[PDB]
Amino acid sequence: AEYVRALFDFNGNDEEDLPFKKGDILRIRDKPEEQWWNAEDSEGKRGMIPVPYVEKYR
């Protein structure tokens, strides 16, 4: 129910991060801190993403 869209590629630094490509659509799964959220990609992969790299999607 909450999706965002990537504004920039993100490649992670840690294994726990979720890489993505500019324009990718992600589902938010948890918001443990303000700037880093847990998300799921179209493939079902999960990991942390940086909030400033995304925008609300639809």
Binding site: D9, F10, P32, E33, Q35, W36, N38, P52
Partner: peptide
């Protein structure tokens, strides 16, 4: 003439 990737925000916690 595009903007660069933003500075990655620091993580408050470990995941």
């Amino acid at each position: 003439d595009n903007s660069p990737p933003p500075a990655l925000p620091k993580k408050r916690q470990s995941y």
